[PDB]
Design a binder for this molecule. Structure first.
Ligand SMILES: Cc1ncc(Cn2c(C)c(CCOP(=O)(O)OP(=O)(O)O)sc2=O)c(N)n1
Ligand SMILES: Cc1ncc(Cn2c(C)c(CCOP(=O)(O)OP(=O)(O)O)sc2=O)c(N)n1
Ligand SMILES: Cc1ncc(Cn2c(C)c(CCOP(=O)(O)OP(=O)(O)O)sc2=O)c(N)n1
Ligand SMILES: [Ca+2]
Ligand SMILES: [Ca+2]
Ligand SMILES: [Ca+2]
Ligand SMILES: [Ca+2]
Ligand SMILES: [Ca+2]
Ligand SMILES: [Ca+2]
Ligand SMILES: [Ca+2]
Ligand SMILES: [Ca+2]
Ligand SMILES: [Ca+2]
Ligand SMILES: [Mg+2]
Ligand SMILES: [Mg+2]
Lengths: 523, 523, 523
């Protein structure tokens, strides 16, 4: 067998059947004779390729396979890899390299020092020393991306390797099963359970790795048993809990002092599947108030090591959440009371308040909709206004890197064909990965894109104001016609200049048979 | 003085007056109080920021200054940095980092292991250990980008550094002059001159560093004195010679055997300002035929080290070209005869042959036009059909990385307001950095964009055919309306479905007062 | 031909005939059939291998070739590479890697991520992608080490590559000549010369790259013409000037304020072949006083970029020193007056003052002796007390890394068999690379080793005192018998407990036919 045939058999045997890619000459020997049981998803720029694959992997809860062109193509994707790193997304990034005979002279398209290019944004990065090693290296990449803590990996392959003979002993790779589905030993788990049972006023904080693990329902049981309020850890990449469950208390503010104040009076705070903590704004103060003990369960040694406070347990989130939820006592305390509905903001017949948009989406969208957020000034309101009952219902760029939601919404919709995806994207954010719209059109992936058009980088104008920073250039983005962009890439386009038009446009979009972009004029 | 004030004074004193950027919160303390004597050029995605800056630096023959957001923004620009590395472009890439107080906890927007992120695509990469070091680090960045061999550099700056007190001893940085304008010592230069004078059938090969140095006219004198044919080194990023001068022989094919065959019979081949050689296709054979000696003059030790044949001299291209041109004897041999004009391809009243497009551009464009090429299947024809008399007249992605020409054409036009820039970009290539069109519209930079629309990644379809590679996915890009994209970003748009319309559209574009996109239907 | 045969032919054709090594199984396919025209120099630990090679390269003014075992052997040498980096030593470090078939599984002796291991202490670091590339990679290594600024390079080679067939086109590598022997263009050089001629009170500062270039005599002519005092730049790795020439003013103190004070009143300071500056102690103040302009000539862009003051010219030191010395005018000013002899320190009949030792060495040693210094508390006195008339007469660990002088003195003595080498090494320093003594014994390289035994890390005890740092552990090294160590490795050993014995021992050592160690009891 050839390296080509052995590698595709390994991929198939390991559950991979889709290649997200943008092609190039160093990849042609890999992409030729493309197997009939595989699907190729083309995107027009590599940030878009990797964003689509990322949304696919996060929603599917399985690795996604990517194939890129050399250094330039890998490079174009590195902002996307920054997000994937922070979301623990299991991405297998392969890049075509020059033929081994031409690497030394640094022919055009040579990926120089290739394994160093994506660092520090990958778990493992490698170029094999020979063609026959390529299947083994691919095996390593699959497992490295897939073991807890999941994350992106990189493999560079010289184009002449594919046609070479494989090692027949590569067959041992095909059916390897590698597990990291582990939890704290029984003795220490009993100690933790007792501490949770003995707490007088526990709180729970959940992060994205809960949703990635589909540990959401177990965390609901845990919260119900402990009669504990539940917060989502700051800068949330995913939604780990039903947002109208009585225990839910919303998104934590991303500040040191704000979080210790919020946690004051809680004697034990159990954090599951989050860094401690993904702060953002400078908000100096105490990490915890006196009287609060924190215990973190994390899938990631790097998270456990850098927490500035608390104990930690490094384990699989699914396994730990299931064990805790089934072992804790049912507390006698009263169940927390649900948060009240948010206020309806006054809305005239002109430009839309973001609150209006989110209320309307919540009114009209299916109960199993999936939302993506890249409308950076409106996140707090979005989290208050969307009832998200189900797992997998929310994604936000985990490193704060714009250009994620537009392509990722396409990959999420590919992963979840029965669940309507609605991406709420600011006018600034929409440009970073605008060409991803074409993939939605070509493959008829029926994502709805809601462009929040306020003409500015609003979150940055806001922050300049908190700073009292004068004379800051580059904060306004006037003069973009998003309906024309949508037409450019073959996506149906609508405008919404007022609430009547927003409702009309959403109605049209929700019944459409293809992707739709709605440009919304916001305040 | 603050670090902010000292740093802007250093930039001004070192000739920097423009910041190419996409803003972000870790940059706000740098961008506030933006000096009135500086210009900010906003682009919507970082590949576009860096591409614009790259074209500006290459055309201006001076460093360009860039300011990006953290890891994600830097990451989005890394495909652009791959090209900048290969073109020796003097780019000072700065990226805003989190406040020093928040780096340890890896708050959102922390650039982790920041100095490693852009490697291996930068000459120097650094994060200062303290705020007061930032001006010195910025000095290092300026000089590292600017010394031969020029290239991109990276500096990460924590946002809290700018407001801190600077070292008063930083004033010594302001007026430093650093020269690498060096040439071979007289004894060894005399040996080289004698070898050139004694050659019976010399040839000259020129690369991009000749154009970067504005050594073009000196190379013309050299070629005239030696009565030698002149070739452009393969995979040419720039045009180093007048393309209708009698000595000019065109673009070398990017293959080992093709180049040795071309050079057969030439006893001495002098290569100036090129790698030896930027081959592309696999074309095995002899690096040189018996009877040919090669001598390379290069600004880059890495080029000299990796050449598989020939002697080398590592020196400044401007200084070496001027010395050689003034020292060699006038040979008695007959001057080479000019290449004949290329053939006119038969053209009906339907879709345009690329040859037609280039002939028409050559007919209608000003004699001092500047061309950019990202129409990958048509490069050989473009090089044959455009009379480029002047330096600075041609740019092509130096690493082969698509997404360069659209933004770079905007930066070149900003650098050369009196010279009409015409970017010839394939329909595939146009998408990589499509959002750069907005910067042309906003700043009214009157670049002309000619989109060669054949519906496919033609160069890859071609190569799959040479390979006899069947069943390759992802090679077609149907369904893109480039006039709608242009409208989306505020750029006037025209179509050309036949030759009559191409001429009409070019006439309109050439007299327009702003940027114009022409979608051309090509065969 | 095999890769083995082609590689040894390349080495021979490029002037390499000696391999400094410590063997291992991944190197056996390289070291077998060792050519009869090559010499192998074995040392017992890799710090010693690289130190010997370093002294050989620095004294010989040519690259030295090293062959080490995998990651562990490379690792053992990395302190030695820190010094080699700072001295610009042209070292070709090769390391044997596992067979390509075993790298993926990470068999014992695999050098994982090999090219990253020696970074950041090498100019270039690489592992070839195929066996046939190894000769080309070796060519790259030779030239990268040898081009200005010279320095160490690293090449990892899988053991199975050597027996494979080489590319016949590798013959083009054999006779490549690569020059970086360049100097400032004539126009700008004339500007510099005029500034030097117009100076009212010039000073000259010289660094190690002057001695490396054998530019010493040209600098003497320069100093004589300009009637200028001459200082050696701080932390001096080499001696660039005759130390009793009338212009010589000694070693600069390694402090910012001390150097600006020393330079006060000098209107133009010309620095040649040094960083600006290799300060050590924290001595804050002005980098230059008002009235002083600095101009640096450096072979290293990294030096030019980081200087905090002054103009710079990046060029070959030999070429620049020769041009300046022949172009400047003879000033009418009076030649500087020689420094007076230093004082004789009072010495009783007990333990030796270091000053006594250096005076006695100066009295008894040949006029063409070569000294090495790793007696860290006595450097200032050594520089005052040794008359070093000739180039190549002094070496000191260029990064401050102990373990250099003992092995380097063996490599210097191998390079300069007619010049008696005398290494003055503290009792602390002597241990770092003690096993290098064996190589001197085995090859009968007649280095003299003078161990300054004061029982302590004296320089650190001194510094703790300037700090008023109490309760510092680990500063004393009692209980080492250096005569027994010398016997252990087969080197003749003497003691000197007083001046009479020092003179007797030096007399014996100077007439010995092999290496000799003298343990001196110092105060
Ligand atoms: C890749 C990248 N570049 C730049 C930024 C900096 N940035 C920018 C540019 C923001 C404004 C986004 O504007 P928008 O129109 O999408 O949304 P709002 O108007 O609601 O802020 S928010 C933010 O952090 C970023 N996060 N990621
Ligand atoms: C960033 C990036 N991604 C992918 C490629 C691979 N690639 C691709 C995708 C090419 C086709 C460009 O198509 P085009 O429409 O611009 O021009 P032609 O139809 O004339 O080939 S040429 C080429 O090398 C690349 N060079 N750079
Ligand atoms: C490899 C290494 N380790 C530790 C040190 C630190 N160090 C040490 C350990 C010194 C004392 C050397 O003691 P010595 O006996 O050789 O000489 P003195 O007694 O004259 O200081 S000087 C110095 O910087 C070093 N420079 N290099
Ligand atoms: Ca409602
Ligand atoms: Ca699915
Ligand atoms: Ca906005
Ligand atoms: Ca014509
Ligand atoms: Ca200009
Ligand atoms: Ca095309
Ligand atoms: Ca004396
Ligand atoms: Ca010798
Ligand atoms: Ca001592
Ligand atoms: Mg990197
Ligand atoms: Mg290392």
């Amino acid at each position: 067998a050839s390296v080509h045939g052995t590698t595709y058999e390994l991929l198939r045997r390991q559950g991979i059947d889709t290649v997200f890619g943008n092609p190039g000459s160093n990849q042609l020997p890999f992409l030729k004779d493309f197997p009939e049981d595989f699907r190729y998803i083309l995107a027009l720029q590599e940030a878009c390729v990797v964003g689509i694959a990322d949304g696919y992997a996060q929603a599917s809860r399985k690795p996604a396979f990517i194939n890129l062109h050399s250094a330039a193509g890998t490079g174009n994707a590195m902002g996307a890899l920054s997000n994937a790193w922070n979301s623990h997304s299991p991405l297998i990034v392969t890049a075509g390299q020059q033929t081994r005979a031409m690497i030394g002279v640094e022919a055009l398209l040579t990926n120089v020092d290739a394994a160093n290019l994506p660092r520090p944004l990958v778990k493992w990065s490698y170029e094999p020393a020979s063609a026959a090693e390529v299947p083994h290296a691919m095996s390593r990449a699959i497992h490295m991306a897939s073991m807890a803590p999941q994350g992106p990996v990189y493999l560079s392959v010289p184009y002449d390797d594919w046609d070479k003979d494989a090692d027949p002993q590569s067959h041992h790779l095909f059916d390897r099963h590698v597990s990291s589905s582990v939890r704290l030993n029984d003795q220490d788990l009993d100690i933790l359970v007792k501490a949770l049972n003995s707490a007088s006023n526990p709180a729970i904080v959940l992060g994205p790795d809960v949703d990635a693990a589909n540990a959401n329902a177990d965390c609901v049981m845990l919260a119900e048993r402990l009669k504990a309020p539940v917060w989502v850890a700051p800068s949330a990449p995913r939604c780990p809990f039903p947002t109208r469950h009585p225990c839910f208390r919303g998104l934590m503010p991303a500040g040191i002092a704000a979080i210790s104040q919020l946690l004051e009076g809680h004697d034990v705070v159990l954090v599951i599947g989050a860094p401690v903590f993904r702060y953002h704004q400078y908000d100096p103060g105490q990490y915890l108030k006196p009287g609060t003990r924190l215990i973190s369960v994390t899938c990631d040694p790097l998270e456990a090591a850098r927490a500035p406070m608390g104990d930690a347990i490094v384990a699989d989130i699914g396994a730990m959440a299931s064990a805790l939820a089934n072992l804790v006592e049912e507390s006698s305390r009263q169940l927390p009371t649900a948060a009240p509905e948010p206020a309806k903001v006054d809305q005239d017949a002109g430009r839309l308040h973001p609150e209006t948009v989110f209320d309307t989406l919540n009114d009209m969208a299916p109960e199993n909709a999936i939302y993506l957020n890249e409308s950076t000034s409106t996140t707090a309101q979005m989290w208050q206004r969307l009832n998200m009952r189900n797992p997998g219902s929310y994604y936000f760029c985990a490193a704060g890197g714009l250009g994620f939601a537009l392509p990722a919404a396409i990959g999420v919709q590919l992963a979840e064909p029965e669940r309507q995806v609605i991406a709420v994207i600011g006018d600034g954010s929409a440009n970073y990965s605008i060409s991803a719209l074409w993939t939605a059109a070509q493959y008829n992936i029926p994502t709805i894109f809601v462009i929040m058009n306020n003409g500015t980088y609003g979150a940055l104008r806001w922050f300049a104001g908190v700073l009292e920073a004068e004379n800051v250039p580059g904060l306004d983005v006037p003069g973009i016609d998003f309906r024309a962009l949508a037409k450019g890439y073959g996506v149906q386009a609508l405008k919404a200049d007022n609430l009547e038009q927003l409702k009309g446009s959403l109605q049209e979009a929700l019944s459409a048979k293809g992707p739709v972009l709605i440009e919304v004029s916001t305040v």
